[PDB]
RNA sequence: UCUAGUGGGCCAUUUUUGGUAAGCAGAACUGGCGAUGCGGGAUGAACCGAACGUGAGGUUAAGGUGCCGGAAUGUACGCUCA
RNA sequence: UCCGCAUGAUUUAUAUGUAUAAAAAUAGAGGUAGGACUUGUUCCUACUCUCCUGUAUCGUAGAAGAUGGGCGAUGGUUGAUGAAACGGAAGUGUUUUAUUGACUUGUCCAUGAAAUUCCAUUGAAAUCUUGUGCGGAAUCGAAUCCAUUGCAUACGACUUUAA
C-alpha cells in the first residue's frame, strides 16, 4: 500500500472578473507546469477525499469524483468536471488526480 | 510547483513585494508559509524615498478618533504582513484563513532554525535588479520609524551563526566520511551504466 | 427526413453520397518529370536586385 | 515581421500617353497588401497617379542573398516629429536588411516615440568599407579580436525550474 | 412501441501496441494496485494477466486495458501458455440475477480455500510452471515482479518513462 | 573567465538545439552572435546570448571562417573529446540516461542503491575502529 | 412519461416578499418605473418567462410518468379503466373514509395507482 | 376603418451661433439613454464591445494575464530615478 | 488526583516519504576536507569541483507487507529504560554512553496472497482528554453575595478589614 496518485490542489471555479461558474473548477497539478504537459492529464480521474462525522456504509470517508477535460492558461493549470461541483470552502485544498484512463 | 506542508522562507535579499505576491498565492493556495529574516528584505529605491512613503503612510489617521484609526505597524515582519495581507481578499473568510495561515517573524527562532530555508528566485534581488540601482533594508528602516529591536536580533542572529557554523562543520566531517566510503564502493560501475 | 446534419468533410459516406467524382479524384498529381528550367531571366534579376 | 517588396507599377493607359513609364520601389511591409499601399501613398506624393488610374504589374517578394554573412546596414530616413520633421540616419549591424528595418523601427519607437505612419524609409544600404561606418558604436564591433563579458541576464530559466516557486539555494554568478 | 433499430454495428477492439503478451504492466486499481504482472492474451478489450502467483499472489484475471500501465521491461516468453482457454465464459460468475437472494452471511462460503473449484489452482499452476524458467532466466524480473510500483516524492508521471 | 569572442566553444540552452555544441566564428553585435557546427543536422546561424551558455574551450579560428574551415579546425583541434572529457559534459551525460532510465532501470538503480548504502556503512564502521 | 428533465425547481417567489409580511408569495410583475427586477439587474431575482416552460411530452406527469387525476367517486375511477398506464388516481381530500376505502379497493382491482393511498 | 399614449426630453461624435467662461443657452447630421439588460472603463443612464426565451459544449469582441482576479513574474530591442 | 487496568471514541489526518537547519557576494574567490603552506591579505597548492540551482541527496522489494532457512560482515533501523549532557529569541528539541527487546531485502531459496475471478477504499500501532469496575491514600483551595472602610464612589466598580 503506497500513493499511486498525482497531488493537486483546488484553486477556484471558472471564472471572468465578477462572474464565477462553479460546473468547472481549477486544478493545480504538482509537476504540471504547462499546457503541453497537461495534455497527459487530460480525462485523467481526479477525486476530492474527506472525512465526515457520520459513518456511512461503515466508514466516515466521502469521495466526489470528477474528470479533468481541458488545459487552463500556460502554467499546466487543468479545468476539471465533478459529478457534484466542489464546495467552494475547499479551495485550496488537496486533490488526487489518478491514473484509471491510462494510455502509455 | 510545490506542495510541501510547510515551507520557511529566508527573507533576506528578497523584494518586499514580489515576495508578498508568492506567498499570497501560496497562501490562498492552501499552503502554510513561515518567513524569517524579514528585517533582512528589500525594496528598491534609494532610504530617502522609501522613509518619505513610509512617514505619508505614518501621516494617515482617523481624525476623530486616532484610536480606532490606521494602525501603523513599524516591525519588519509586521511590514511584510501589511503588504502580504493588501495582496489578499482579507475582508473574506477565505483570505483570513489565507493570512492566518501566515507566520512572519524577525530573525530565525528556535522553532524554525533547526529546518530547511528556501529561496523564491522570481523575488530575488541579486537577479531583478540592476546592479547600481539603490535600494533599502526594512531592517534599517523599521529602526528609524520605530523599531526598537534592531540589536537584540543582530547579537541573536550572530549567536545563531556560530552555532549553526558548528552544526555544519560536524554535518560536514559526517559527509565526508559518507562520500569517502562511498567513492569505494564495489557497485559504481554498474551504478555508472545507469548514469548514477 | 434529414434529423441530422452530417458534415461531408468528415463523414466519407456522404461524401460519397454527394460528389460521386470524389471516388475517382486523384490528387498530389507528379508533373516535375522534366529538366526543371530555371526561368529567371537576366533582366529581370537585375531589376530584382538594382539598388 | 516585416518582409522585403519590390512593386513596379505605371498609370493605366490613356489615349494621351498610351506607353506610361514603369516605377519601381523596395518597400517593408508585413504583407503584399500592405506594401502595395505604400506603394500607392509613396507614388501619389511624386506622380500624379492614384490607385483607381493606375495598376500594379508586378510584385515580387526579395530574400537576403547573404543571410549567412554578418553586415553593416546604412538606413536614411524622414520622420515627422510633434514640432516638425527631421532627416536622420541610423547604422546597424545585422545579417538581413529586414532585420536591420525592424531594429530601426524599434529603436526609433524607443528614442523618439515615432510610430510607423511616421516614418519614410528613404534609402537602405550596405556598407562595405570599414571607414564608410560613422558610428563608433557599430564600428568598434569590426575589430577581429573583439572580446566583452556575457551581458547581463536574468539568469537561466527553464521550463519547469523557472516556474518552480522555491528554490533549495541562492544562485550564484 | 418496439422502437428503431440503431445502425450500431460491433467491431473488434483495436489495442495500444503497447499491451502485447508477454508484456509487464502495472495494476493501477482493484485489490491488486500497484503489482506488477505479466500479460498473457488479450479477449476483447481486457488483458487477460497474471503475475506468477508464486511470487507476488496475484491469480489469472482480467484487467481493463484502460487501468494498466504498460511498462518497457524486457518481453517474457508467453507463447507456450495455453491462452485459447481463456475466454469471457471462463470469466465469467455464475448466473444469479433471478433465482437468487442477496443474503448476507455467505462470506464465509464465499471465502477461498472452499470457493475456489477444481482445475483452477490447476491451471494456475500449469501457467506458473510454464513461465517462471523465463521469468527466472532475467536477472532482478522475479524481484520486480514481486515489488510493487509506487510514486515517491518528485515523481512525475507525465515525464517518466514507465 | 568566460568571453564572448570568435572561436569560443558554446552551448546552445534554448531552442531546438538544446543540448548541442557550437562555436563562435563571427560577432554581430552584444546582443547576437553567428555560430556554426560541424554536426550535419546544426546549419549556419545566428543564436542570442540568452539562449546559449559559455564554455571554457577557445579555439584558434579565424573570424568569419567558413563551415569547411570551421570543421577542419574543429577536427584538428580536440574540442569534442576536450568537452567531453569535463565535468559539465559527464554531469549532463548522466542526466540523459537517468532521464532515458524506465521503470525497470530504476528498479536495478534501487537495488544497487541498497547494496551500495549496507556496503558504505559497514565500511564507515570499520574505520571508525581504526 | 420517459426522461423528465425539470428546467426549474424554483417556484418564482415574488420580490420584497421575504422582507414585508403583507407582501406575498405569489409572483406579482414588477412595473415600477425603477425597478431592478423588471430591468433584469445582475444579481436580481428572475422573472417567469416561457422559455422555462417544460417538454410537452414529459409536462403535467409526476416523476413517475403519471398524470395525478382527480377522483371523488368511484366512477371517476372506472373513468381511468383504459388509461392505466398514464393516469394514476388522486383521491379528494373531502372523501369520507368509507368512501375512500371503496376507492382504493376499486383502483386497486383495475390496477390504477393511487398517489393519496394510506 | 377605429382608437390609445405622446405633444417637459437628455447624452455622445461631427458642423456651429450667442457668451469671459460654464456640468451654460440655442440650431444641423448620426448613434444612443429615455424604454437597454450583459462583458469592459475600480464606480457611473449615454463611452468601448455587444442588443437579452430556458440550458450544454466550443470560440470571440472591447478589455486584460504580479497578488487581490480568470489568464505568460512571456519573448525581442531601447529609454526613465522622480 | 498518579500508577496498573483494557475498552470505546477523537485526531496528528489541511497526511499519504507530506525526509533534508552553514554563512556571505553576485564581473565572484564561487567555497565542495575545498585542496596549500606558518594562521599568513602568503599561498601558485588545485587549477577546472562552480556554470544540468534540487531532474539533487537520503530513503523506497516483503499477505498496508506473512511464515521458516544457507551464507556476508559484526554493521543498520525502530521502540522500554540508564547516567546524562547541550539547548531561554517562542529554549518543549538535539546528541553520547550502558542495560535490554523487535526487525534487517546484503546475496541466494521454501511455503502462503486468488472467488474481492475488470474500478467505484481506506490499513493498523502510538500519542491528549472523557463515558466504569475500582484496589492504593486523599498532601491539598479560593472567589463572590450578605457585612466593614473611605486613600474611592451616580449605580456598578475601587482601596481596606473579616471566620
Redesign the pocket.
Known sequence: ????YV?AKH??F??????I?P??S?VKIEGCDS?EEAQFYLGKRICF???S?KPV?????R?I?GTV??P??????V?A?FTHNLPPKTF???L?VML?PSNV | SE????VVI?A??HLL??????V??QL?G?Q?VVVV?CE?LNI???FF?NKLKYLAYLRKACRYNPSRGAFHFRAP?RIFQKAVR????HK?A??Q?AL??L?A???????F?????V?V???????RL??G??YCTVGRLSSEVGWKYSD??SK??E???V???A???A???K??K?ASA?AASSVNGKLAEFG? | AHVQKKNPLKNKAVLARLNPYAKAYKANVKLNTGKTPKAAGEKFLTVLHEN | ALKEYQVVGRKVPTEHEPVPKLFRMRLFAPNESVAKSRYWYFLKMINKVKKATGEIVAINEISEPKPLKAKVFGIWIRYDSRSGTHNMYKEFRDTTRVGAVE?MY??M???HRARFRSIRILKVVEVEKKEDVRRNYVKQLLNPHLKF?L??????????????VF??????? | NVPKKARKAVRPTKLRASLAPGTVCI?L??????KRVVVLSQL???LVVTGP????????????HR?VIATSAPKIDVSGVSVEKFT?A?????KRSGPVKKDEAF?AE????N???AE??AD?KAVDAKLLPAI?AI??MK?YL???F?????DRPHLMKF | ??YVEVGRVVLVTKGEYTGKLAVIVDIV????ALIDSPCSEFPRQVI????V?LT?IVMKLPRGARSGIVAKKWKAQDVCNKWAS???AK??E??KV??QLNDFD??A???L??????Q???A???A?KA | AVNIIK??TKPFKRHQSDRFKRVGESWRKPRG?DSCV??????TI?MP?????NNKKTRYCMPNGLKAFLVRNVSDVELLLMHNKTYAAEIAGNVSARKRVEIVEKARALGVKVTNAG
Not at chain 5, 464465499?110 to 480455500?113: M, Q
Request: aromatic letters at 6%; glycine letters at 10%.
Open positions: 500500500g503506497h500513493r499511486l497531488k484553486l477556484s471558472q471564472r471572468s472578473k465578477h462572474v461558474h460546473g468547472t481549477l499546457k477525499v474527506y472525512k462525522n456504509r461503515g466508514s466516515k470517508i469521495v469524483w477535460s481541458r487552463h492558461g500556460n502554467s499546466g493549470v479545468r468536471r485550496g485544498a488537496s488526487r484509471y | 506542495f510541501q506542508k510547510v529566508d533576506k535579499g513585494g514580489r515576495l508578498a505576491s508568492v499570497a498565492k490562498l492552501g502554510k529574516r533582512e528598491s529605491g534609494h524615498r515582519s493588501g495582496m489578499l481578499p473574506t477565505r483570505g484563513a492566518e495561515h507566520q517573524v524577525e530573525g530565525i527562532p528556535p522553532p532554525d533547526k529546518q530547511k530555508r529561496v528566485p522570481a523575488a530575488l534581488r541579486v537577479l540592476k546592479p540601482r539603490k537584540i536580533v541573536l542572529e549567536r545563531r551563526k552555532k549553526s557554523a552544526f555544519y562543520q554535518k560536514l566531517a559527509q565526508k559518507i562511498k548514477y | 531594429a524599434a529603436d519607437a524607443a528614442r563579458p551581458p547581463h541576464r536574468r539568469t537561466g530559466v527553464v521550463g519547469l525550474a523557472g516556474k518552480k528554490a533549495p539555494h541562492r544562485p550564484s554568478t | 495494476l486499481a482493484g485489490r491488486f494496485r500497484g476483447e478489450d481486457t502467483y508464486k511470487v507476488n499472489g496475484v491469480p489469472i484475471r482480467r484487467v481493463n487501468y469471457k471462463y470469466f465469467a460468475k455464475q462470506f464465499n471465502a477461498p480455500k470457493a475456489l473449484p483452477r489452482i494456475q527466472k536477472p532482478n524481484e514481486a515489488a510493487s509506487a510514486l515517491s516524492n518528485g | 573567465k568566460r553585435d552584444h546582443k547576437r542570442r546570448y540568452g539562449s551558455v571554457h569535463s565535468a559539465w554531469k549532463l548522466a542526466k537517468r532521464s530504476r528498479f538503480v534501487m537495488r542503491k541498497k547494496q551500495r548504502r549496507e558504505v556503512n559497514v564507515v564502521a570499520k571508525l | 428546467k426549474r418605473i423588471r430591468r433584469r439587474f445582475r444579481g428572475s418567462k416561457i422559455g422555462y416552460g
